[PDB]
A = this chain, B = another copy of it.
């Protein structure tokens, strides 16, 4: 006898660090290009954007490769393309660091609510991050998906036989973690770490600055769902 029954959690940049490592890869990529191009010139013009193979580490590497070949008019040396491959390989072999307060927060939540990890990305690398994280033991239901759109979240909830009104999703993206869930009648917790359509006065949302606030926020949303 309670309103919210299930709490979902994003992976990358919610449960564990990810973007930091992609920023390191990007820094290394630009260092390679700086041997060929004047990158201190508002004039380049990437457009890594255009070459997205995907947004995961494999897609990033192929995109970095195409970009480098394009921007250097195919003058880039094979030895330096090998260095871009080593960036992706290094990014793929990154043990993920769990975000401080996350294990405590999930444990506290898992004491009163069912939980599910819903992560979009490369299946292989995401399974590796889940394993590396040590968080498997708190998540008996784990979903890796190719897209976070309303229908994918709906499909997930349909497998739990649970209406969206009894679900809270926690994530670092208003666009891909909160908005789609609101769209099907759910609740969100946003912990920031792609314009989105979330209304400035959205009542079914809390912004929680760090994971230590997630349990209180779930309970707050649960009381609201009970009154509403």
Contacts and interface: CB of A to CB of B under 8 A. Distances in A.
Interface of A: 53-55, 58-59, 61-62, 65-66, 68-69, 72, 74-79, 81-82, 85, 88-89, 92, 121-124, 127, 144-146
Nearest to A54: B124
A75 B79 CA distance: 8
Contacts of A144: 123
Of A121, A122, A145, chain B has the most CB atoms within 10 Å of the CB of: A122
A103 to B, nearest CB: 24
Contacts of A88: 62
Given A59-B58, A62-B61, A88-B62, A124 B81 contact: no
Nearest to A155: B140
A62 B81 CA distance: 10
A214 B65 CA distance: 44
Contacts of A54: 58, 123-124
B78 A72 contact: yes
Contacts of A89: 53
A124 B123 CA distance: 9
A125 to B, nearest CB: 8
Nearest to A72: B78
Contact of A85 (B62, B77, B122, B123): B62
A78 B77 CA distance: 7
Contact of A53 (B53, B58, B78): B58
A79 B76 CA distance: 9
B62 A69 contact: no
Contacts of A76: 78
The 5 closest A-B pairs by CB, nearest first: A54-B124, A74-B78, A123-B123, A74-B79, A124-B146
